[PDB]
Amino acid sequence: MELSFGARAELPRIHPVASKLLRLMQKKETNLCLSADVSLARELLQLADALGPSICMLKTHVDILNDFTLDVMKELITLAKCHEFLIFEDRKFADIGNTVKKQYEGGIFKIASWADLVNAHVVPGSGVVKGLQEVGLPLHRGCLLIAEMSSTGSLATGDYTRAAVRMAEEHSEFVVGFISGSRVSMKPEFLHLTPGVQLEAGGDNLGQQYNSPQEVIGKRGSDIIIVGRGIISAADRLEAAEMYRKAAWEAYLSRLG
Amino acid sequence: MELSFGARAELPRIHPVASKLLRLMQKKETNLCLSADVSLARELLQLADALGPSICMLKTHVDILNDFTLDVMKELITLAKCHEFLIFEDRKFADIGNTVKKQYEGGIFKIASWADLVNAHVVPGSGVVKGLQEVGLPLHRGCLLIAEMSSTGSLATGDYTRAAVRMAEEHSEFVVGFISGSRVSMKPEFLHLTPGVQLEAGGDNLGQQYNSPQEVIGKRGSDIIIVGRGIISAADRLEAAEMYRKAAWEAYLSRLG
Ligand SMILES: Cc1cn([C@H]2C[C@H](O)[C@@H](COP(=O)(O)O)O2)c(=O)[nH]c1=O
Ligand SMILES: Cc1cn([C@H]2C[C@H](O)[C@@H](COP(=O)(O)O)O2)c(=O)[nH]c1=O
Prior knowledge:
2 copies of one chain form a homodimer.
Chain A: H1 5-8, H2 16-28, E1 32-35, H3 41-51, E2 57-60, H4 70-83, E3 86-93, H5 97-105, E4 117-121, H6 127-136, E5 142-146, H7 159-169, E6 175-179, E7 191-194, E8 202-203, E9 209-210, H8 213-219, E10 224-227, H9 229-232, H10 237-256
Parallel strand pairs in A: 1-2, 1-10, 2-3, 3-4, 4-5, 5-6, 6-7, 7-10
Antiparallel strand pairs in A: 8-9
The structure holds thymidine-5'-phosphate (TMP) (2 copies).
């Protein structure tokens, strides 16, 4: 018996960040996360403003933002609050717990001070989560664990995926879901976000592999599609975002029955 | 048949950045990499200058450097040239090929412009290496693949480690070695760098596990020790670096018989 996003937002064990996300997904009829893989602050803010109404989440990539400052982040947060979407930073936390804590809080980027969500690879073992949560829990943040990857030759399969699920379900005070290609947890409190999404079949020239919104949401049971080039390379980015939103949303409704 | 670092520098298939490293290791009698996990440029540069003569490599951590600028990295290059050590940036590239390319070249940090070596996780598949290579190849950079991890619960074991070795073998134009706990390749062109090293037994409270220089160089067959807190937390970091250098160097000499 599958629950709607709005009902999942109310589950007793839901994490506050997941609840906030699920409520705005339901309100706005969007389960699309825009991957904003851009080099300029002006492009990031322009896309966030123009596409904000169509998205539940914006995945930032601050490591490639040539003119990052914390003032840009302040402005991005203003747009996120106005249009109602969460900010998910791309950075791949993937080190021992002692140093990921410093990477999350510190440096020039101060990721924990503006990202609602971050993601981590599980390869270090659960210390990666324990280190992140020492920063994320005081800042009321959530984390996604990379349980599967979309690229050719991915090693995030089999027992590796199972380890990611166990690590999430044992750190539910901080971990709110997964980056995955499919549903991997049977617990409805966890979110599933799927990159490697385009309307048409294909890939890229460096190992990316694409599946459609209907396949990943409808057949594979994921919750949210993450789309970069399928939107940003389109002539009309607003229309492209709307096409992806409508595709992902219908696929969700049809699985819901 | 074990070869000295100086002889390995002359191997037919050696990459130019590995040859440079192996030659300075032999010249200076050091197989120590300092893990400069500090948040201030002045401390980084003071450590690089004082410990430069004792190290073959300095592992930077720019994501935690609160006052990073490219001018700081210019001064680090000057010290690296003066004292003869390589610069290895910590950032754990762990994305699809198309995005890691941009992360390596771009943003504020412009890692490829100053780092001799970078490291990647192999979980995405070989596209991670191909994307980095598209930037680093003409710059005579090299990459290290994370084949094993030192932390409790590491998933970099078994077939995962074997996949890392195969990926390195198959990309030897750019991959010059491993982050590992032991020798994982039989090919002497490859470097093995081992973190999780301290003179004393123990660990940390976030899953780090330590082994001694004698164990990891002498018994486990690795080439270089990566040492952070064992040096950084000492009152006199120069004396500590010298203790680690002598331990790792004499363990290496023991192998040669
Ligand atoms: C963990 C993970 C991230 N991503 C990231 C890389 C890009 O920032 C984004 C996909 O962008 P794209 O839609 O332009 O291919 O998602 C994957 O594509 N696959 C994965 O498995
Ligand atoms: C890939 C990898 C990196 N590292 C990094 C994290 C730190 O920057 C450094 C170890 O620092 P430490 O000597 O203070 O524990 O090396 C590991 O400790 N283990 C690993 O397996």
